Design an enzyme around this catalytic site. Structure first.
Site, PDB file in Angstrom:
ATOM      1  N   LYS A  92       0.925  -1.305  -0.138  1.00 23.44           N
ATOM      2  CA  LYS A  92      -0.107  -0.069  -0.065  1.00 23.44           C
ATOM      3  C   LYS A  92       0.921   1.452   0.010  1.00 23.44           C
TER       4      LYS A  92
ATOM      5  N   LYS B 200      -2.683  -4.871  -8.944  1.00 26.91           N
ATOM      6  CA  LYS B 200      -2.506  -3.812  -8.523  1.00 26.91           C
ATOM      7  C   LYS B 200      -3.573  -2.707  -8.676  1.00 26.91           C
ATOM      8  CE  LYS B 200       0.849   0.111  -9.194  1.00 26.91           C
ATOM      9  NZ  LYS B 200       2.362   0.442  -9.241  1.00 26.91           N
TER      10      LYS B 200
ATOM     11  N   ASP C  39      11.685   5.407 -13.383  1.00 22.97           N
ATOM     12  CA  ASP C  39      11.563   5.300 -12.080  1.00 22.97           C
ATOM     13  C   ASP C  39      12.134   3.933 -11.384  1.00 22.97           C
ATOM     14  OD1 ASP C  39      10.946   6.264  -9.475  1.00 22.97           O
ATOM     15  OD2 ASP C  39       8.566   5.905  -9.652  1.00 22.97           O
TER      16      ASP C  39
HETATM   17  N1  LIG Z   1       6.532   1.174  -4.180  1.00 25.82           N
HETATM   18  C1  LIG Z   1       6.259   0.889  -5.045  1.00 25.82           C
HETATM   19  C2  LIG Z   1       6.011   0.270  -6.506  1.00 25.82           C
HETATM   20  N2  LIG Z   1       5.675  -1.022  -6.400  1.00 25.82           N
HETATM   21  C3  LIG Z   1       4.714  -1.871  -7.373  1.00 25.82           C
HETATM   22  O1  LIG Z   1       4.193  -1.022  -7.985  1.00 25.82           O
HETATM   23  C4  LIG Z   1       4.624  -3.300  -7.352  1.00 25.82           C
HETATM   24  C5  LIG Z   1       5.098  -3.918  -6.163  1.00 25.82           C
HETATM   25  C6  LIG Z   1       5.006  -5.248  -6.307  1.00 25.82           C
HETATM   26  C7  LIG Z   1       4.351  -6.119  -7.394  1.00 25.82           C
HETATM   27  C8  LIG Z   1       4.173  -7.346  -7.252  1.00 25.82           C
HETATM   28  C9  LIG Z   1       4.150  -8.039  -8.644  1.00 25.82           C
HETATM   29  C10 LIG Z   1       4.047  -9.236  -8.386  1.00 25.82           C
HETATM   30  N3  LIG Z   1       3.899 -10.167  -7.567  1.00 25.82           N
HETATM   31  C11 LIG Z   1       4.197  -9.479  -6.287  1.00 25.82           C
HETATM   32  N4  LIG Z   1       4.228 -10.425  -4.852  1.00 25.82           N
HETATM   33  C12 LIG Z   1       4.741  -9.760  -3.557  1.00 25.82           C
HETATM   34  C13 LIG Z   1       4.681 -10.717  -2.549  1.00 25.82           C
HETATM   35  C14 LIG Z   1       5.015 -10.442  -1.296  1.00 25.82           C
HETATM   36  C15 LIG Z   1       5.254  -9.007  -0.920  1.00 25.82           C
HETATM   37  N5  LIG Z   1       5.574  -8.581   0.492  1.00 25.82           N
HETATM   38  C16 LIG Z   1       6.050  -7.211   0.691  1.00 25.82           C
HETATM   39  C17 LIG Z   1       5.808  -6.869   2.216  1.00 25.82           C
HETATM   40  O2  LIG Z   1       6.004  -7.739   3.324  1.00 25.82           O
HETATM   41  C18 LIG Z   1       5.113  -8.955   2.789  1.00 25.82           C
HETATM   42  C19 LIG Z   1       5.777  -9.569   1.458  1.00 25.82           C
HETATM   43  C20 LIG Z   1       5.112  -8.017  -2.016  1.00 25.82           C
HETATM   44  C21 LIG Z   1       4.851  -8.400  -3.212  1.00 25.82           C
HETATM   45  N6  LIG Z   1       4.333  -8.045  -6.090  1.00 25.82           N
HETATM   46  C22 LIG Z   1       3.988  -5.422  -8.505  1.00 25.82           C
HETATM   47  C23 LIG Z   1       4.109  -3.799  -8.594  1.00 25.82           C
END
Ligand SMILES: N#CCNC(=O)c1ccc(-c2ccnc(Nc3ccc(N4CCOCC4)cc3)n2)cc1
Length: 296
Positions: free
Chosen positions: A13, A32, A133
């Site tokens: 978030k 997303k 970015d």
């Molecule tokens: N700040 C900022 C911008 N980040 C993004 O837009 C973003 C972030 C993650 C993903 C994404 C894509 C595919 N899979 C995942 N999996 C995922 C698994 C675990 C977590 N966690 C992080 C926080 O603690 C628990 C694990 C985050 C993403 N994320 C896509 C876009």
């Protein structure tokens, strides 16, 4: 389509919106949901994934775009593959790396960036793309140790055949922590496409620094830290960044223990060649990819 996806848990978030793990036909997917203030990025990224048909093993795998109406508002969804290891920012805080693991991560990121930058000519060739970015929070770690690049809402495109430049229309600005010096002091030439590639290189150097700190050599390894952690506060301001990156000409410090290891020493030289104040002195993404392939 969104109505067939069961949102199971929120894994992120922020100002961009939120990121969910969801189930579609009993298997995981990433959703997303873009914030109201970041609608333009959803439009831009939908153009790349749908029209340009961007795909590559080091670019987050696209599944579908969609709009869904819920709670008397309309939401913009971007649905992609799910990577249970999270982002490089999360991964690096939970594990150290050996020599081979460290080189996959940085080689795969350079491989992803090169694909974006390089134009494919012909019938329906993809134009050249600058990301603008890049950071450790929008790079994902796959189960085979390689990474892939995400969060393409700020991208800029170019075609040398026609030689027109598509900067889009997005009020979003880059993450201030990672901003390049020609950005911070407003000299970057916004009409020249090369200017945006050289911005990706600066940011790549910083992510390279973030990862190398986590490789172990001779029983020594640094804690994870973000760039410039020691001289700026959290959520730093435009003015903070400029004081450090332009006025004082500071760069991430090279730990001395790196100089008693051959891989880390060759990676340190590569970083510094991504960090020149003069943007045109920086290496290209292809050059970086080639050098990382011969380092061992
Ligand atoms: N700040 C900022 C911008 N980040 C993004 O837009 C973003 C972030 C993650 C993903 C994404 C894509 C595919 N899979 C995942 N999996 C995922 C698994 C675990 C977590 N966690 C992080 C926080 O603690 C628990 C694990 C985050 C993403 N994320 C896509 C876009």
């Amino acid at each position: 389509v969104a109505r067939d996806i069961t949102l199971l848990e929120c894994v992120g978030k922020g100002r961009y919106g939120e990121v969910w793990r969801g189930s579609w036909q009993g298997e995981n997917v990433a959703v997303k949901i873009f914030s109201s203030r970041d609608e333009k990025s959803w439009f831009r990224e939908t153009e790349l994934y749908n029209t340009v048909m961007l795909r590559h093993e080091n670019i987050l795998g696209f599944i579908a775009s969609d709009m869904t109406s819920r709670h008397s508002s309309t939401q913009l969804w971007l649905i992609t593959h799910y990577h249970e290891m999270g982002s490089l920012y999360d991964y690096l805080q939970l594990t150290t790396l050996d020599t081979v693991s460290c080189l996959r991560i940085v080689l795969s990121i350079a491989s992803g960036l090169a694909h974006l930058h390089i134009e494919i000519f012909g019938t329906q060739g993809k134009p050249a793309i600058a990301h603008r970015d890049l950071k450790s929070k929008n790079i994902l770690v796959k189960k085979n140790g390689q990474c892939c690049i995400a969060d393409l809402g700020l991208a800029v495109m170019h075609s040398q055949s026609t030689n027109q430049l598509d900067v889009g229309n997005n009020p979003r600005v880059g993450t201030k922590r990672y901003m390049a010096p020609e950005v911070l002091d407003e000299t970057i030439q916004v009409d020249c496409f090369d200017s945006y590639k050289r911005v990706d290189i600066w940011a790549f150097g910083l992510v390279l620094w973030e990862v190398a700190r986590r490789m172990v050599s001779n029983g020594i390894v640094e804690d994870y830290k973000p760039p410039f952690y020691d001289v700026v506060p959290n959520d730093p301001s435009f003015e903070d960044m400029r004081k450090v990156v332009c006025v004082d000409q500071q760069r991430p410090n090279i730990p001395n223990r790196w100089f008693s290891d051959p891989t880390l020493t060759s990676l340190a030289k590569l970083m510094k060649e991504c960090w020149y104040q003069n943007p045109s002195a920086r290496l290209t993404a292809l050059r970086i990819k080639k050098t990382l392939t011969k380092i061992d």
